[PDB]
Amino acid sequence: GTILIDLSPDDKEFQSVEEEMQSTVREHRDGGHAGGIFNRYNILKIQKVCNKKLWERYTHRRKEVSEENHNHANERMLFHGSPFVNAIIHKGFDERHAYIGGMFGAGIYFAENSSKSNQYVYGIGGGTGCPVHKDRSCYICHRQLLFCRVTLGKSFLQFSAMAHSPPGHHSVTGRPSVNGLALAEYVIYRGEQAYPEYLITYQIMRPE
Numbered sequence: 001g002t003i004l005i006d007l008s009p010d011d012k013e014f015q016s017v018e019e020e021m022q023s024t025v026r027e028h029r030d031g032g033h034a035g036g037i038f039n040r041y042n043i044l045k046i047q048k049v050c051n052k053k054l055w056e057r058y059t060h061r062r063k064e065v066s067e068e069n070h071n072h073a074n075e076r077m078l079f080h081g082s083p084f085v086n087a088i089i090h091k092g093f094d095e096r097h098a099y100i101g102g103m104f105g106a107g108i109y110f111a112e113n114s115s116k117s118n119q120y121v122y123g124i125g126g127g128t129g130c131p132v133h134k135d136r137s138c139y140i141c142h143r144q145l146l147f148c149r150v151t152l153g154k155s156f157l158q159f160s161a162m163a164h165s166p167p168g169h170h171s172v173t174g175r176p177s178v179n180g181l182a183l184a185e186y187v188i189y190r191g192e193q194a195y196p197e198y199l200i201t202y203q204i205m206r207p208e
């Protein structure tokens, strides 16, 4: 049921998604080990992910959460990187897309920093890097990330350096407590709480 609609680079929607991609790059504590060395991306394509059944699955859950939280879904747009991006856009998020070993338990993880999600494009820790060159810092190969609509509801705040949500909460927020430049990361424990709105195709760019 999924169709992908290309956005034009002239479209304000392309431009605002690109700006969120580019402006949320940061340096990582691994010096680029997992995701590569870069300060910015070459955006090759942005597509809207259109699936009526998956969208209705998301909105149904969003209303349930909203009604449990004084009519506030606490909806965000966040990045997701995964080797399973193709399955996700076709079948939706579910338990098979969870980070079993994540620091907030087995759930589906999202990031404010696009460069954080970029570390997972080729697997946990960047895996063995790109299929073609086995390079986690490949500047040639095309990568994909999702920019997703995510319902957080009442989020459990974890200060720090599938399972169930903590009782009385709908998500977990991983607040950065050491690296002053890191943005928040978030975990949901029901795949119905995220919709993969945009598929972004890009390369990381070698710094000059």
Ligand SMILES: N#Cc1ccc(-c2nc3ccccc3c(=O)[nH]2)cc1
Residues within 6 Å of the ligand: 079, 080, 081, 082, 083, 097, 098, 099, 100, 109, 110, 111, 116, 117, 118, 120, 123, 124, 185, 186
């Ligand atoms: N298998 C698998 C698997 C796929 C994706 C991730 C993943 N983790 C993150 C952890 C923190 C912040 C963001 C992410 C993310 O975008 N993605 C983790 C594991």
Ligand SMILES: [Zn+2]
Residues within 6 Å of the ligand: 130, 131, 132, 133, 134, 135, 138, 139, 140, 141
């Ligand atoms: Zn490559």
